[model samples]
Target: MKIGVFVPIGNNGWLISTHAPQYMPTFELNKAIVQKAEHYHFDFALSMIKLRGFGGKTEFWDHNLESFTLMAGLAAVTSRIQIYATAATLTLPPAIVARMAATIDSISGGRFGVNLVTGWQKPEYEQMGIWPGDDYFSRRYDYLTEYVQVLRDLWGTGKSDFKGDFFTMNDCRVSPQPSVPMKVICAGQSDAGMAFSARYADFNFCFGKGVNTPTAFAPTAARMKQAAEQTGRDVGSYVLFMVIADETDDAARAKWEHYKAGADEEALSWLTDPTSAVNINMGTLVGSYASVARMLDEVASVPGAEGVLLTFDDFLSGIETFGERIQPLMQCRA
Candidate 1:
């Protein structure tokens, strides 16, 4: 029954087309957006980390802002609304991450959290000579489990003597501990990834599937729910959707087609030679305000669903539209 936005921390939001809005990541832009989210009483805002971008005319993901620092800034500017930053685990030491998260907690007055993403893209880390080789592809989740243990130890007890196959922390301490429990999340949907989330994460985010079917992600949520059932952890499913709304269904559909029509082949080729629903294949909703409102209500009723995180075709005005037109009509929002 909650809603949030995946704030654009990269160029052109999540779309992989030149026809999508062309914009660079900016603090002013994000600050205004999250401030608006707070005004609307959204539950949380998250920004994913990206180190490399698939290159072409659109230069998809080429311009990305560091998540932690950006979230810290967003925290300082807003009074409420939970703020989360994704950490590319392989790229940062857990002890340092613990300290960084604690610092943001101070800025956000305990309204900060972290999203764990085991680094997958080789080029993103290999460029810095820290990819840890191809061997990591399979064991990344194992490493992440240890990585989070180090964070939990340091944050919960102020020190860590944790030792694991991937990490060895010798009495590492993070002073000035977080004032509140550090909430964690992950957005991966694999057996290994699901196991990791079930055992640890508070929210297990997954892709929402189908078009205009708000509850299409019910199966994804049900999967996470079953995974949590195994571990008996209080994990909730968070679904992701990309909205392309207009005054009418035809207008919105036309916009989606135009965006797809201008798919940046040069850039997309770098992303596996594909159009493939663009924008990392997030579930899409294309319709008028009333239609979108009805669909969102359906999403709210999904089993074990805690919330839905959204990506807009154009966030600058999309948030405004949601606050005005769609949200006003949604039974769930009321």
Candidate 2:
């Protein structure tokens, strides 16, 4: 029943539409959102790493803030809610991320963690000449297996001499290790991806199904638990959802229809591409305050569902409304 905000690090939060709110990301904007989340006693906040944006009328996600640096800044300002920043495993060395995470941990007094992702978009890395090409499409998780091992070594023992396919360490060490043990999170749906997470990750995040279909992803959570059991591990599942709420169900439905009707065809084409379906399958909830709260309860009722990570059509007001009105009615929150 834990609730967390998927802090907007991109120009537009999650929607890629001409009708959705259009604005560039700024530290000040994120500061306000996280501060409010903390004020509301939310469990955690996380930001994703996006190196490229799809081109269209909306110019979606073209502008984004780097995840780790942004969370480091938020760490200094917030005292309670946990913060998670993603590491693009293909681009950054694990040792460097471990050291940077330790730095953020010091700033947050042990309230920081890492979300690991194997990059999906080719152009995102290919533009930088780092994309390993189609061969990687089949073995990305194999590469990630070596990456997380290095992180575990450095964080658990302060040094690593591990040798593996993707990385080799020779007496590599990180001093000033984190005051608290770092937590690892992964968003993996493929069998290989889930197996890697079961072996190492503290939790696995899965996309929620369709608009207002809160329990649609219960099967995904079940699969994650099944995978963890095979490894003799106990990892939880956190589901991702987008919330669009208003005073009445009709009011909210109207807004949802408008946004979809104006959906940026060019931008959505990239999201809906058959090759990238795994990357873009997120659940959405659109309804009035009471209805939205009810749907979230359904999400909580699903077995193996540990928490929910939320994005909003309008973040500023959305957080406030959840705090002041919606949260109080949820039985799960109680």
Candidate 3:
């Protein structure tokens, strides 16, 4: 099974808690993480774009590095491992994104790809006066379809005269096409979102569920499979999981309990609130090295699951353990 990382572009990695290891997002920090992953022979690394944050004592995700630029820098430094950056379709023009992607493709020696997102959080764009109002919530995927169409037209042929409801291109051109075809990924869970991904994305990211319940996300991958069948496309599922590991089962269990006990109520409340976009997607796994490794193998076992993208509670130690200990035990990795 392919293993990829969700790099911590946001502060404090994926934990929105007062007790989790706290740190700011820095190029140096992320560079070290990706470098280590490359040395460990991990398959890929992806960074997300977050324009807003959920307010709390931790100020979760408020401090974030822009994805494309960060990956561009990483492309210069890393020789192996694929790198991806999220494109906020709502915020950037397709032509501009197409060009930037090509630039990164060159820097990374064609190892770059794009993750496309139809913005879910309102304030992320509304604060910038580009939210397109509440009605957009219903037709966001429609907008994305047109957006990807424009991207495809440009990337595949270097010119587009395509016209669509959300975007129109008239002789628009991108030069120096990527040395290789660029892969596009999407993290869309809703039916409309999945359908869009099935039609256009190479892979769709599904939220993994619960600690140690590896196959709990099977239904999500199944949903993607059903969607892909309808479209006659070969899209695969990439499950997103958070890993919190320790040397021993008891030690890992204790750490998880401590973090849960200190969960930042205000920040977590934002995630759970019905109106927030954060609801119903983030999945987690918590255990010792052996248990986590076993669960990851089970994650790979899910139907239509092509890969696993992981986040770490404590990244430096987490990656080290996964590479040095956990990954060595996984039958899938073997």
TM-score of each: 0.96, 0.96, 0.95
Question: Which regions of candidate 3 fall more than 4 Å away from where they truly are?
Answer: 273-281
Worst 10 residues of 1 by lDDT: 273-282
The per-model lDDT (C-alpha) reads: 0.88, 0.89, 0.87
Report the Cα lDDT for candidate 1.
0.88
lDDT digits (tens) for residues 1-334 of candidate 2: 8998999999888877788888888999999999999998899999999999886797888899999999999999999999999999988999999999999999999999999999998999999999988999899998988898899899999999999888989999997888998999999998888898899899999888887778989989989989999999988899998888999989998987777767788876876511112124458777889999999999999988999999988889999999988898899998
Q: Model 3 — TM-score against the truth?
A: 0.95
| Tens-digit per-residue lDDT, 108-182, candidate 3 | 999999999998888889898998988899999989988999888888999999898877788999987888998
Off by over 4 Å in 2: 273-281
